[PDB]
Structure formats: structure tokens, C-alpha cells
Short mmCIF file of C-alpha atoms in Angstrom, two decimals:
data_model
loop_
_atom_site.label_atom_id
_atom_site.label_comp_id
_atom_site.label_asym_id
_atom_site.label_seq_id
_atom_site.Cartn_x
_atom_site.Cartn_y
_atom_site.Cartn_z
CA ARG A 1 0.00 0.00 0.00
CA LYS A 2 1.53 3.30 -1.09
CA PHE A 3 2.05 5.94 1.56
CA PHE A 4 -0.47 8.70 1.13
CA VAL A 5 0.10 12.27 2.38
CA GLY A 6 -2.70 14.79 1.83
CA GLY A 7 -2.28 18.46 2.73
CA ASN A 8 -5.64 20.15 3.34
CA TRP A 9 -4.85 23.89 3.19
CA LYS A 10 -8.45 24.61 4.35
CA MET A 11 -9.43 28.33 4.14
CA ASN A 12 -5.87 29.71 4.21
CA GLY A 13 -3.40 31.42 1.89
CA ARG A 14 -3.25 33.89 -1.00
CA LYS A 15 -1.52 33.67 -4.40
CA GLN A 16 1.75 35.07 -3.05
CA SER A 17 2.11 32.84 0.06
CA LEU A 18 0.69 29.74 -1.68
CA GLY A 19 3.03 30.30 -4.65
CA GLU A 20 5.97 30.31 -2.24
CA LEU A 21 4.73 27.11 -0.55
CA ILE A 22 4.30 25.45 -3.97
CA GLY A 23 7.95 26.28 -4.88
CA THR A 24 9.14 24.46 -1.75
CA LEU A 25 7.00 21.41 -2.64
CA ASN A 26 8.19 21.43 -6.28
CA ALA A 27 11.81 21.47 -5.00
CA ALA A 28 11.33 18.58 -2.53
CA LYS A 29 12.10 14.94 -3.34
CA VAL A 30 8.98 12.77 -3.06
CA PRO A 31 10.20 9.36 -1.80
CA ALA A 32 9.57 6.07 -3.56
CA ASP A 33 6.24 4.43 -2.86
CA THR A 34 4.71 7.79 -1.80
CA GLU A 35 1.67 9.73 -3.09
CA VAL A 36 1.28 13.44 -2.27
CA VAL A 37 -1.96 15.40 -2.72
CA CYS A 38 -2.67 19.08 -1.91
CA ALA A 39 -6.18 20.52 -1.37
CA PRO A 40 -6.21 24.30 -1.90
CA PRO A 41 -9.07 26.68 -1.17
CA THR A 42 -11.61 26.41 -3.99
CA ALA A 43 -10.71 29.79 -5.46
CA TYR A 44 -7.11 28.55 -6.00
CA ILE A 45 -7.58 24.98 -7.38
CA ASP A 46 -6.76 26.16 -10.92
CA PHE A 47 -3.91 28.45 -9.75
CA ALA A 48 -2.36 25.65 -7.68
CA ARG A 49 -2.60 23.06 -10.48
CA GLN A 50 -0.80 25.40 -12.94
CA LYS A 51 1.99 26.17 -10.41
CA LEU A 52 2.46 22.68 -8.89
CA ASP A 53 4.66 20.08 -10.62
CA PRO A 54 2.70 16.99 -11.86
CA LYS A 55 4.37 14.86 -9.12
CA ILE A 56 1.92 16.46 -6.65
CA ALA A 57 -1.77 15.96 -7.35
CA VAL A 58 -4.45 18.55 -6.58
CA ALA A 59 -7.69 17.96 -4.68
CA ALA A 60 -10.83 20.05 -4.25
CA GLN A 61 -11.90 20.44 -0.60
CA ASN A 62 -15.60 19.79 -1.41
CA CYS A 63 -18.04 19.38 -4.31
CA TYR A 64 -21.77 18.93 -4.97
CA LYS A 65 -23.71 15.92 -6.30
CA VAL A 66 -24.84 16.86 -9.87
CA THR A 67 -22.86 18.01 -12.89
CA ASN A 68 -24.55 21.40 -13.37
CA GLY A 69 -27.46 23.27 -11.72
CA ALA A 70 -29.06 26.01 -9.64
CA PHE A 71 -26.72 25.71 -6.64
CA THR A 72 -25.23 29.13 -5.92
CA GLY A 73 -21.83 28.77 -4.23
CA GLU A 74 -21.14 25.12 -5.19
CA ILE A 75 -18.83 23.39 -7.64
CA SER A 76 -19.31 20.08 -9.51
CA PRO A 77 -16.80 17.24 -10.11
CA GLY A 78 -16.72 18.25 -13.80
CA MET A 79 -15.40 21.72 -12.85
CA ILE A 80 -12.74 20.17 -10.63
CA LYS A 81 -11.43 17.95 -13.47
CA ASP A 82 -11.65 20.86 -15.93
CA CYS A 83 -9.19 22.69 -13.62
CA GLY A 84 -6.79 19.67 -13.78
CA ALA A 85 -7.50 18.40 -10.25
CA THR A 86 -7.87 14.60 -9.82
CA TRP A 87 -9.15 14.24 -6.22
CA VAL A 88 -11.93 15.54 -4.00
CA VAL A 89 -12.08 15.51 -0.18
CA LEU A 90 -15.63 14.55 0.89
CA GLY A 91 -17.28 14.42 4.30
CA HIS A 92 -14.56 16.32 6.17
CA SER A 93 -15.48 16.93 9.84
CA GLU A 94 -15.95 20.65 9.17
CA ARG A 95 -18.48 19.94 6.40
CA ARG A 96 -20.37 17.51 8.71
CA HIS A 97 -20.19 19.44 12.02
CA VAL A 98 -19.90 23.15 11.14
CA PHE A 99 -21.91 23.02 7.88
CA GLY A 100 -24.39 20.21 8.67
CA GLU A 101 -23.69 17.95 5.64
CA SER A 102 -25.63 14.70 6.24
CA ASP A 103 -24.42 11.14 5.53
CA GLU A 104 -27.04 10.82 2.75
CA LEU A 105 -25.65 13.90 0.98
CA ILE A 106 -22.02 12.78 1.41
CA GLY A 107 -22.95 9.39 -0.09
CA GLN A 108 -24.58 11.02 -3.12
CA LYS A 109 -21.45 13.21 -3.56
CA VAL A 110 -19.14 10.19 -3.35
CA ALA A 111 -21.15 8.40 -6.08
CA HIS A 112 -21.24 11.40 -8.44
CA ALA A 113 -17.52 12.21 -8.01
CA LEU A 114 -16.43 8.63 -8.69
CA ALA A 115 -18.78 8.41 -11.74
CA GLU A 116 -17.13 11.57 -13.08
CA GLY A 117 -13.62 10.04 -12.85
CA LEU A 118 -12.33 11.77 -9.68
CA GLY A 119 -10.47 10.10 -6.82
CA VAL A 120 -12.17 10.53 -3.44
CA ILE A 121 -10.63 11.11 -0.02
CA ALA A 122 -13.66 10.09 2.10
CA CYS A 123 -13.52 11.33 5.69
CA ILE A 124 -15.15 9.76 8.75
CA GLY A 125 -14.97 10.33 12.51
CA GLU A 126 -16.75 10.37 15.85
CA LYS A 127 -17.26 13.32 18.23
CA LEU A 128 -16.33 13.40 21.95
CA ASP A 129 -19.90 12.71 23.21
CA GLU A 130 -20.12 9.72 20.82
CA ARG A 131 -16.78 8.30 22.01
CA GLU A 132 -17.58 8.75 25.73
CA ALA A 133 -20.92 7.00 25.17
CA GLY A 134 -18.97 4.04 23.70
CA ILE A 135 -20.38 4.23 20.17
CA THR A 136 -17.12 4.90 18.29
CA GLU A 137 -17.54 1.72 16.22
CA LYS A 138 -21.25 2.31 15.52
CA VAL A 139 -20.53 5.84 14.26
CA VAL A 140 -17.49 5.16 12.03
CA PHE A 141 -19.00 1.89 10.68
CA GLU A 142 -22.28 3.67 9.74
CA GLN A 143 -20.28 6.47 8.03
CA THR A 144 -18.02 3.94 6.21
CA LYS A 145 -21.11 1.90 5.18
CA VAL A 146 -22.74 4.94 3.52
CA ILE A 147 -19.49 5.57 1.61
CA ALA A 148 -19.14 1.85 0.66
CA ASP A 149 -22.73 1.70 -0.63
CA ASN A 150 -21.73 4.46 -3.10
CA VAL A 151 -18.36 3.04 -4.25
CA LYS A 152 -18.20 0.61 -7.19
CA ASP A 153 -14.38 0.63 -7.61
CA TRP A 154 -12.25 1.19 -4.48
CA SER A 155 -8.94 1.76 -6.35
CA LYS A 156 -9.88 5.47 -6.58
CA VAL A 157 -10.85 5.78 -2.86
CA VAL A 158 -8.81 6.63 0.24
CA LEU A 159 -10.39 6.56 3.73
CA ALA A 160 -9.42 9.24 6.26
CA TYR A 161 -10.18 8.76 9.97
CA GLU A 162 -10.53 12.12 11.77
CA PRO A 163 -10.63 11.75 15.56
CA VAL A 164 -13.03 14.71 15.99
CA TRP A 165 -13.19 13.93 19.74
CA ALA A 166 -9.47 14.99 19.83
CA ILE A 167 -9.41 17.83 17.21
CA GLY A 168 -9.73 21.03 19.24
CA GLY A 169 -7.98 19.51 24.74
CA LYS A 170 -7.83 15.74 24.29
CA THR A 171 -4.91 14.18 22.34
CA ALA A 172 -5.02 10.81 20.56
CA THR A 173 -2.15 8.35 21.06
CA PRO A 174 -0.70 6.23 18.17
CA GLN A 175 -2.30 3.16 19.88
CA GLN A 176 -5.78 4.78 19.71
CA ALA A 177 -5.25 5.61 16.03
CA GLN A 178 -4.15 2.02 15.25
CA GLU A 179 -7.16 0.58 17.09
CA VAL A 180 -9.63 2.52 14.89
CA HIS A 181 -7.74 1.88 11.63
CA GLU A 182 -7.66 -1.90 12.29
CA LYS A 183 -11.39 -2.05 13.15
CA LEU A 184 -12.05 -0.05 9.93
CA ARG A 185 -9.97 -2.44 7.80
CA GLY A 186 -11.74 -5.32 9.58
CA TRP A 187 -15.06 -3.77 8.49
CA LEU A 188 -13.90 -3.55 4.85
CA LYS A 189 -12.65 -7.16 5.01
CA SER A 190 -16.06 -8.45 6.21
CA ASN A 191 -18.43 -6.14 4.28
CA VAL A 192 -16.58 -5.59 0.94
CA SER A 193 -13.71 -8.05 0.26
CA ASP A 194 -10.26 -9.02 1.49
CA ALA A 195 -8.69 -7.49 -1.65
CA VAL A 196 -10.30 -4.10 -0.82
CA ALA A 197 -9.23 -4.38 2.85
CA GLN A 198 -5.67 -5.21 1.81
CA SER A 199 -5.32 -2.45 -0.83
CA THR A 200 -7.35 0.55 0.44
CA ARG A 201 -5.32 3.27 2.19
CA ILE A 202 -6.68 4.33 5.58
CA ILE A 203 -4.99 7.62 6.52
CA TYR A 204 -4.95 9.46 9.85
CA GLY A 205 -6.63 12.89 9.92
CA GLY A 206 -5.83 13.81 13.54
CA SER A 207 -3.16 16.18 14.81
CA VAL A 208 0.28 15.30 13.41
CA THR A 209 3.67 17.03 13.68
CA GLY A 210 7.24 16.32 12.52
CA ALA A 211 7.99 14.84 15.98
CA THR A 212 4.98 12.43 15.99
CA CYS A 213 4.56 11.40 12.27
CA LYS A 214 7.19 8.57 12.33
CA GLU A 215 5.56 6.58 15.14
CA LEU A 216 2.09 7.11 13.62
CA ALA A 217 3.27 6.03 10.15
CA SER A 218 4.93 2.86 11.53
CA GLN A 219 1.53 1.62 12.84
CA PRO A 220 0.48 -1.46 10.75
CA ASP A 221 -2.90 -0.04 9.69
CA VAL A 222 -2.01 3.67 9.32
CA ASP A 223 -1.18 4.33 5.64
CA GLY A 224 -0.52 8.10 5.76
CA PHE A 225 -2.06 11.41 6.77
CA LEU A 226 -4.66 14.01 5.93
CA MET A 227 -2.99 17.07 7.46
CA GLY A 228 -4.79 20.30 8.33
CA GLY A 229 -3.39 23.85 8.27
CA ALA A 230 0.04 22.60 9.40
CA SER A 231 0.42 21.35 5.77
CA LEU A 232 1.16 25.02 4.90
CA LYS A 233 4.40 25.01 6.94
CA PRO A 234 7.92 23.62 6.19
CA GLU A 235 6.89 20.81 8.57
CA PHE A 236 4.82 19.21 5.71
CA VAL A 237 8.04 18.01 4.02
CA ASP A 238 9.00 16.05 7.21
CA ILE A 239 5.51 14.32 7.15
CA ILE A 240 6.13 13.37 3.49
CA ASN A 241 9.22 11.49 4.75
CA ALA A 242 7.45 9.93 7.79
CA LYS A 243 8.39 6.43 6.55
CA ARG B 1 -29.22 55.54 -8.91
CA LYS B 2 -26.97 53.72 -11.40
CA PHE B 3 -28.71 50.77 -13.15
CA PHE B 4 -27.27 47.45 -11.94
CA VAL B 5 -27.28 44.12 -13.83
CA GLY B 6 -25.83 41.06 -12.08
CA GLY B 7 -25.47 37.69 -13.82
CA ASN B 8 -25.32 34.79 -11.35
CA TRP B 9 -23.98 31.82 -13.35
CA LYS B 10 -24.65 29.55 -10.33
CA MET B 11 -23.16 26.01 -10.68
CA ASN B 12 -22.87 26.04 -14.48
CA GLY B 13 -20.20 26.03 -17.14
CA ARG B 14 -16.69 24.82 -18.01
CA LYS B 15 -13.63 26.83 -19.17
CA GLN B 16 -14.59 26.25 -22.81
CA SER B 17 -18.29 27.27 -22.62
CA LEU B 18 -17.65 30.09 -20.12
CA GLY B 19 -14.79 31.40 -22.28
CA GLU B 20 -17.22 31.59 -25.21
CA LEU B 21 -19.82 33.39 -23.06
CA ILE B 22 -17.13 35.85 -21.88
CA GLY B 23 -16.22 36.68 -25.52
CA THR B 24 -19.86 37.63 -26.19
CA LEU B 25 -19.91 39.85 -23.06
CA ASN B 26 -16.57 41.46 -24.00
CA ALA B 27 -18.00 42.23 -27.47
CA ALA B 28 -21.23 43.80 -26.16
CA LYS B 29 -21.56 47.57 -25.63
CA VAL B 30 -22.11 48.35 -21.94
CA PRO B 31 -24.26 51.50 -21.67
CA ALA B 32 -22.98 54.60 -19.91
CA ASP B 33 -25.44 54.61 -17.02
CA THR B 34 -25.04 50.86 -16.32
CA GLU B 35 -23.00 48.66 -13.94
CA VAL B 36 -22.58 45.01 -14.95
CA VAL B 37 -21.38 42.24 -12.60
CA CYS B 38 -20.89 38.50 -13.29
CA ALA B 39 -20.76 35.82 -10.57
CA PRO B 40 -18.98 32.66 -11.83
CA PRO B 41 -18.73 29.35 -10.00
CA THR B 42 -16.06 29.65 -7.30
CA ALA B 43 -13.54 27.49 -9.16
CA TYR B 44 -13.64 29.99 -12.08
CA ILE B 45 -13.53 33.41 -10.31
CA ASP B 46 -9.84 33.86 -11.20
CA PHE B 47 -10.30 32.43 -14.74
CA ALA B 48 -13.27 34.73 -15.40
CA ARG B 49 -11.50 37.84 -14.08
CA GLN B 50 -8.49 37.23 -16.39
CA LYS B 51 -10.74 36.65 -19.46
CA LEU B 52 -13.40 39.35 -18.83
CA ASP B 53 -12.79 42.96 -19.91
CA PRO B 54 -12.54 45.43 -16.95
CA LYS B 55 -15.94 46.96 -17.94
CA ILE B 56 -17.56 43.90 -16.33
CA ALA B 57 -16.84 43.32 -12.63
CA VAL B 58 -16.59 39.86 -11.06
CA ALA B 59 -18.45 38.61 -7.97
CA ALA B 60 -18.02 35.54 -5.79
CA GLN B 61 -21.26 33.58 -5.24
CA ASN B 62 -20.58 33.11 -1.49
CA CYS B 63 -17.90 33.61 1.19
CA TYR B 64 -17.28 32.92 4.88
CA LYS B 65 -17.00 35.29 7.86
CA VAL B 66 -13.28 35.26 8.89
CA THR B 67 -10.13 36.03 6.91
CA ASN B 68 -8.46 32.62 7.29
CA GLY B 69 -9.27 29.44 9.27
CA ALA B 70 -10.16 25.76 9.63
CA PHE B 71 -13.18 25.83 7.28
CA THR B 72 -12.73 23.15 4.63
CA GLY B 73 -14.61 24.09 1.46
CA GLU B 74 -14.97 27.84 2.15
CA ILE B 75 -13.31 30.97 0.83
CA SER B 76 -12.71 34.32 2.56
CA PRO B 77 -13.23 37.89 1.25
CA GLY B 78 -9.41 38.25 1.12
CA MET B 79 -9.20 35.37 -1.39
CA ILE B 80 -11.93 36.91 -3.53
CA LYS B 81 -10.04 40.25 -3.76
CA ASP B 82 -6.74 38.41 -4.38
CA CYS B 83 -8.41 36.90 -7.50
CA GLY B 84 -9.38 40.45 -8.71
CA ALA B 85 -13.10 40.15 -7.85
CA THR B 86 -14.76 43.19 -6.22
CA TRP B 87 -18.20 41.85 -5.18
CA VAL B 88 -19.75 38.99 -3.23
CA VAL B 89 -23.34 37.68 -3.41
CA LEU B 90 -24.53 36.92 0.15
CA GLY B 91 -27.70 35.29 1.43
CA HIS B 92 -28.91 34.01 -1.95
CA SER B 93 -32.08 31.89 -1.63
CA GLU B 94 -30.14 28.70 -2.42
CA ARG B 95 -27.69 29.34 0.44
CA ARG B 96 -30.64 30.01 2.84
CA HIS B 97 -33.08 27.29 1.68
CA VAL B 98 -30.96 24.45 0.19
CA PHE B 99 -27.89 24.94 2.43
CA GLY B 100 -29.51 26.23 5.64
CA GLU B 101 -27.50 29.46 6.07
CA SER B 102 -29.12 31.39 8.96
CA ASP B 103 -29.74 35.16 9.16
CA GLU B 104 -27.15 35.44 11.97
CA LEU B 105 -24.48 33.85 9.75
CA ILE B 106 -25.42 35.98 6.72
CA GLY B 107 -25.16 39.11 8.89
CA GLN B 108 -21.69 38.14 10.09
CA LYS B 109 -20.65 37.49 6.46
CA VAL B 110 -21.97 40.87 5.34
CA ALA B 111 -19.97 42.64 8.07
CA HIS B 112 -16.71 40.81 7.33
CA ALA B 113 -16.96 41.27 3.53
CA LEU B 114 -17.62 45.00 3.80
CA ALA B 115 -14.79 45.43 6.35
CA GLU B 116 -12.46 43.73 3.87
CA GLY B 117 -13.34 46.23 1.08
CA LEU B 118 -15.68 44.07 -1.04
CA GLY B 119 -19.01 45.20 -2.45
CA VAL B 120 -21.96 43.07 -1.31
CA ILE B 121 -25.04 42.00 -3.25
CA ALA B 122 -27.27 41.11 -0.26
CA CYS B 123 -30.22 38.89 -1.12
CA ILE B 124 -33.58 38.64 0.63
CA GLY B 125 -36.89 36.96 -0.13
CA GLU B 126 -39.92 35.10 1.16
CA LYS B 127 -41.06 31.55 0.32
CA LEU B 128 -44.53 30.55 -0.95
CA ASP B 129 -45.83 29.38 2.48
CA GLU B 130 -44.66 32.70 4.00
CA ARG B 131 -46.39 34.77 1.29
CA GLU B 132 -49.67 32.78 1.44
CA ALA B 133 -49.68 33.25 5.24
CA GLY B 134 -49.42 37.03 4.62
CA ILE B 135 -46.02 37.55 6.27
CA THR B 136 -44.12 38.84 3.22
CA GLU B 137 -43.29 42.13 4.97
CA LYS B 138 -42.30 40.48 8.27
CA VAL B 139 -39.90 38.13 6.45
CA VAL B 140 -38.17 40.62 4.10
CA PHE B 141 -38.01 43.34 6.82
CA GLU B 142 -36.39 40.90 9.32
CA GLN B 143 -33.87 39.85 6.62
CA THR B 144 -33.18 43.50 5.60
CA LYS B 145 -32.82 44.50 9.29
CA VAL B 146 -30.12 41.84 9.89
CA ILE B 147 -28.23 43.13 6.81
CA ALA B 148 -28.68 46.79 7.90
CA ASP B 149 -27.37 46.07 11.40
CA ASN B 150 -24.13 44.85 9.75
CA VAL B 151 -23.65 47.67 7.21
CA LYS B 152 -21.67 50.76 8.22
CA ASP B 153 -21.33 52.20 4.68
CA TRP B 154 -24.17 51.52 2.21
CA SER B 155 -22.31 52.84 -0.88
CA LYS B 156 -20.82 49.34 -1.32
CA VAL B 157 -24.17 47.51 -0.90
CA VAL B 158 -26.86 46.50 -3.39
CA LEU B 159 -30.09 44.84 -2.18
CA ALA B 160 -31.60 42.04 -4.27
CA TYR B 161 -35.21 40.93 -3.76
CA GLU B 162 -35.72 37.29 -4.81
CA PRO B 163 -39.39 36.30 -4.98
CA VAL B 164 -38.66 32.69 -3.87
CA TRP B 165 -42.44 32.08 -3.80
CA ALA B 166 -42.32 32.49 -7.63
CA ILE B 167 -38.93 30.86 -8.48
CA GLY B 168 -39.73 27.24 -9.44
CA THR B 169 -43.23 26.90 -7.93
CA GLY B 170 -45.63 27.47 -10.87
CA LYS B 171 -46.37 31.05 -9.73
CA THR B 172 -45.16 34.07 -11.75
CA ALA B 173 -44.62 37.56 -10.33
CA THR B 174 -45.99 40.60 -12.19
CA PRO B 175 -44.06 43.93 -12.50
CA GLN B 176 -46.69 45.44 -10.11
CA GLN B 177 -45.85 42.83 -7.42
CA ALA B 178 -42.12 43.50 -7.86
CA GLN B 179 -42.66 47.27 -7.50
CA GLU B 180 -44.81 46.79 -4.37
CA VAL B 181 -42.00 44.90 -2.56
CA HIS B 182 -39.22 47.25 -3.73
CA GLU B 183 -41.15 50.33 -2.52
CA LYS B 184 -41.94 48.80 0.90
CA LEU B 185 -38.21 47.89 1.15
CA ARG B 186 -37.08 51.42 0.29
CA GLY B 187 -39.73 52.71 2.73
CA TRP B 188 -38.11 50.53 5.42
CA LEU B 189 -34.63 51.95 4.66
CA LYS B 190 -36.05 55.50 4.71
CA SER B 191 -37.58 55.01 8.19
CA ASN B 192 -34.93 52.77 9.84
CA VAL B 193 -31.63 54.01 8.28
CA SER B 194 -31.87 57.43 6.55
CA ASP B 195 -33.40 59.16 3.56
CA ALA B 196 -29.97 59.41 1.88
CA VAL B 197 -29.55 55.61 2.05
CA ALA B 198 -33.12 55.05 0.78
CA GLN B 199 -32.53 57.44 -2.11
CA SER B 200 -29.12 56.06 -3.17
CA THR B 201 -29.21 52.27 -2.51
CA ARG B 202 -29.95 50.09 -5.57
CA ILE B 203 -32.73 47.54 -5.00
CA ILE B 204 -32.54 44.97 -7.83
CA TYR B 205 -35.05 42.31 -8.86
CA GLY B 206 -33.92 38.68 -8.55
CA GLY B 207 -37.03 36.99 -9.99
CA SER B 208 -37.62 35.57 -13.44
CA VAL B 209 -36.70 38.13 -16.13
CA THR B 210 -36.47 37.77 -19.92
CA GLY B 211 -35.66 39.99 -22.91
CA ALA B 212 -39.43 40.50 -23.45
CA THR B 213 -40.18 41.55 -19.81
CA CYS B 214 -36.99 43.45 -18.68
CA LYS B 215 -38.03 46.91 -20.06
CA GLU B 216 -41.33 47.08 -18.12
CA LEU B 217 -39.61 45.79 -14.94
CA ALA B 218 -36.74 48.31 -15.31
CA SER B 219 -39.17 51.23 -15.81
CA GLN B 220 -40.73 50.57 -12.35
CA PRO B 221 -39.80 53.53 -10.04
CA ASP B 222 -38.19 51.37 -7.33
CA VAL B 223 -36.61 48.61 -9.46
CA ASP B 224 -32.96 49.56 -10.11
CA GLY B 225 -31.82 46.47 -12.07
CA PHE B 226 -31.60 42.68 -11.94
CA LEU B 227 -29.85 39.73 -10.33
CA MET B 228 -30.41 37.12 -13.03
CA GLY B 229 -30.01 33.38 -12.55
CA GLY B 230 -28.91 30.79 -15.12
CA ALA B 231 -30.54 32.81 -17.94
CA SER B 232 -27.51 35.15 -17.59
CA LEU B 233 -25.53 32.45 -19.48
CA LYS B 234 -27.64 32.98 -22.67
CA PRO B 235 -27.44 35.70 -25.41
CA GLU B 236 -30.57 37.10 -23.71
CA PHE B 237 -28.33 38.64 -20.95
CA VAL B 238 -27.19 41.37 -23.40
CA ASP B 239 -30.85 42.48 -23.93
CA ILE B 240 -31.18 42.79 -20.12
CA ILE B 241 -28.06 44.96 -19.92
CA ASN B 242 -29.95 47.34 -22.30
CA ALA B 243 -33.30 47.17 -20.38
CA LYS B 244 -33.22 50.95 -19.80
#
């Protein structure tokens, strides 16, 4: 399974600062057996794709579920491909929990994006109140099931576990990350196939730094990272070399 | 009051088709007394600004309420200006009614966008169930009040009335019904803000408008222009630019 490092720039950066960041990424050596993807703010997908070297792929941070329509403020998978981007991040914790995107909607988006030829980074995660109630498995399995029901071919899909319970005074240990990733791969093994379980990347979307990345990456069922705003710093190059 | 024509392209188009549309807009003669703004899909704001002639301004279709942050999928007013766009459409009916954007949030967005030096096209409107209950005024006045509470300088603001009750329901709105809402809205501004703001602020019509109806709508005393939907992608848009 190839190491997968996604940098989600979120709502940060301008042409000048992002152009500088891109130059540092273009200059860096991507190791063997490693896949790097960058998700700029929507206004800069096109800009980023033109400036970034082909060795780094570009992702949209969100999309909608039909090709064209009366949806002020949205973008379709067709627009994303037309700008040269090959991935879309779907179901990120901020879309679910700040912007109220339901599992039904996320499923419909997954299906449309895949049908339009995009790769999908599909995000899942449980909140603090869900974890403390002891329904971590119920939550992430129901989220993964909705994704799985809308995926025909898994070769274009990467799963990202976001420990929302620990994003913004509790920290998650590498053992707690491994435990969720293994239960998730176990779910795929039972409900899809062993081939899909074996081959699908499950990446960690919790807090990761240059000092933690190596231990996290060495976990058997952690296949990489979906990094937040820290992906804008020089630190991101250390995470690329976490193996 | 300078006549104002906004074309909201919504979630439509690709570089090729939008590039063709832009060539037609670049070739058209913008009248002297007229201000034309185009709102492309977010992925094409930058593309559209580089291709469009300066005589047409560019608007974002939405934005968020802080300059930078952990808000996957959003863009800030700073990003919009950095791409050469000078306007943002806020509180469009689709953001309110498909995507659940509250009045509180829209107010916060208005304030941040204006503070960052953008112009704002601030949209308001009542649904069918609200109109048939007879609370058209209550709804549009509450929406306009939330906007007004977040506007320090009105010179950068345009109000757009969207008759949501008539967009996509099988009801059509007459030019008399448009005028009635626009005049009550200007009356509200006159009483609750100032006469100067009432007299100078453009109130544009965001309902269904065609080349055959635009002239009668534009001649209404309190209709100052249009925020057109997907019909702004057709040749028809040029007739609307010349509605006066």
C-alpha cells in the first residue's frame, strides 16, 4: 500500500504565500512508494494546479452531487477535473459538524464524483460525546457503510479517519489511532472483500507534527495522513518522509 | 441611482463554454449609465476575471465570515479580492433554503466582507408558504434588518429581492408585485436608516426576467436592475443589460 500524504490547506493562503509554498513542494524529493496530494481553497484549485509540478496531485476540498445546476456557491466534479485536479475531499469533519452535511448527501457526492472520474478522499470520525458513550464503532461503521454503498471501484478511494473527539484539549495516542484503523480495515474485510481491505489506504486525519509522524506512520494499519493547516508550513516536508 | 445588472452563473459552465460566453460579453456595448457584474462558480472566479474585460466586474457567489481558518470548502473575502473580484453575493435563496445558512451567519458574512473592502449584493426573499400566510413584509423586513445592522457604509451595498415564492413553484410575479416589494423595502430603509440611504441604494429584482419583460420591470420607479439566474448564461443577458 503506497504511503499517502494529503495536505488540506483549508481556508488559508493567498496567491503570493501559496506560490511560495508550492515552490518548496516542487523542489522537494517525493520518496519512492509515496503519493502526495494538496487541497487548496476552492478559489485557487486552478492556480495551484498550474503552479504545482505533476508529481503532486491537486484535490478540491468539497463538491456537490450533480454536474450542473441552480446551486449558488457550489462546484461540480466536472469543474474540478476541468481545472486539472484529480481528487476531491468529501465528508470532512468541518463539512459535517460546522456546515451540517448529512451522511445521505455525502454518499450522493461520493457516487457522483467517482462516476465523473475523480479520486475521493472520504472522511469519517466520531465526536467526543459519541466516544464517551462508547459508540465509536457504531458511528465510524455507519459512516463507512454509507461511503461503501456508493463506491463501485475502491482503487480510486482513500479513507481518512478524523478523531473529531481529539481535534480542538484531548490528544489521541498512536495506539488509539491504530485501534480505529484496524477495526475499519476489519469492516472492509467483512463487508466488501479481502482485496479491498488489503489495498485501500486508511490515513490518519488527527493532529500530526514532525515529531509524531514517524511513530504514527509505523503503525500497521495507518497508511498516511490528511494534514490540516500545518500542511502550509515547512513541517509538511518532514511528514512526506514519515516512513 | 446607477442601473445594476448582475449575472449569477450559479453552478454552471466549463472553461470552454464560459470562455465563449465571456467573448460575447466582452464584445457587447455596456451603456454609460449601467453597472454590470458577473458571478462565476467559485472554481472559475480567477479564470473569469483574467478573461473578462474590466468593464464587467466579477463577484463571488458566497464567502465565509473570517479572513483565514479551519473551514474546509470555504473561501474568505481576502481570497476573492486576491483573485481580482470586487463583489460577493450573500444570502442568496439557495444558500438560505438548500444549504440552511441562517440570518445570523449571513449578517456576520456581510460585516466581514464589507470590512475587507468588497461590495456586497445582499439577497432577501420570502417563500410561498410565507407569502400565502401574509407575512411577506415580516420576512423581508427581518432579513433586511439583519443586513442593515451589519452595514456601516451603504455605498458598497446593493439589495436584491428574490421572490422565492415564484422561483420554481408554478407562480409568476408581475411587474406590479415587484414594485410593491421594492417600494416597501425602500420605505423601510427611509424610516430605519436614513433618507440618503433610501434614495441612493440600488434595490434589484432577482425573480424571473427575460428579454421581453426586462423593459417594463426596469421602468418601475423602485426597481434599479436585476440579479439574473442561469438565464444570464444565454445571449438574452445582453438584452437585459440594455433594459433601460
